[PDB]
């Protein structure tokens, strides 16, 4: 009798399935990426990247670096008032 049946030859399931494209993508995309990723810039070494570390971090939305940076410009024209007068 008939021993002809679906199971003996299978090769349509092993390409036809949709997650294969995603699978082979993410073995290439992921295998070496960091499991988190590192923190917003904090030191580039110039002796002012340390200034960034305390105030002007990406996680800081606090008004402190703004105040500090603003205050520098106040010091410039105020002295120059006394340099011109």
């Amino acid at each position: 009798v008939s021993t002809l049946i679906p199971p003996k030859v299978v090769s349509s399931k092993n390409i036809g399935s949709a997650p294969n494209a995603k699978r082979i993508a993410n073995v290439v995309h992921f295998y070496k990426s960091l499991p988190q990723g590192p923190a917003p810039a904090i030191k580039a070494n110039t002796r002012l990247a340390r200034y960034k570390a305390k105030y002007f971090d990406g996680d800081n939305a606090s008004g402190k670096p703004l105040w500090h940076f603003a205050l520098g410009i106040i010091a410039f024209g105020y002295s120059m008032e006394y340099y011109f007068h």
């Binding site: 990723g37 590192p38 923190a39 917003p40 810039a41 904090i42 960034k52 002007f56 971090d57 990406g58 996680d59 800081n60 939305a61 670096p65 940076f69 603003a70 410009i73 106040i74 410039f76 024209g77 105020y78 120059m80 008032e81």
Partner: protein, 100 residues
């Protein structure tokens, strides 16, 4: 030297910091300060996609962006109680307008 020349330098130094000490780590999440420069990008993207809305909307988007940022920064310079705007030299602004 020249006060005007000095203030052109200050503007350049402010603008670099917005994509260096604001763009911290080049995060795919985006730094809290850098969320502002995403929003500026998008609201002018959607504005000149509105206004001109061609395929040349984005082709004239850098010019429309540096005219934004220039005025945006130079009215921070104007808030400083002893530093005087580049825009307050009217001859630069009016000249720029006629040129465009």
């Amino acid at each position: 030297l020249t006060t005007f020349s000095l203030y052109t330098i200050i503007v350049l130094l402010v603008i670099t910091s917005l994509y260096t000490l604001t763009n911290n780590n080049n995060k795919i999440i985006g730094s809290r300060w850098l969320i502002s420069q995403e929003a500026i990008y998008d609201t002018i993207m959607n504005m000149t996609k509105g206004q001109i809305g061609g395929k040349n909307w984005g082709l004239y988007f850098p010019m429309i962006f540096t005219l934004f940022m220039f005025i945006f920064i130079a009215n921070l310079i104007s808030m400083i109680p002893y530093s005087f705007a580049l825009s307050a030299h009217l001859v630069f602004i009016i000249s720029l307008s006629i040129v465009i």
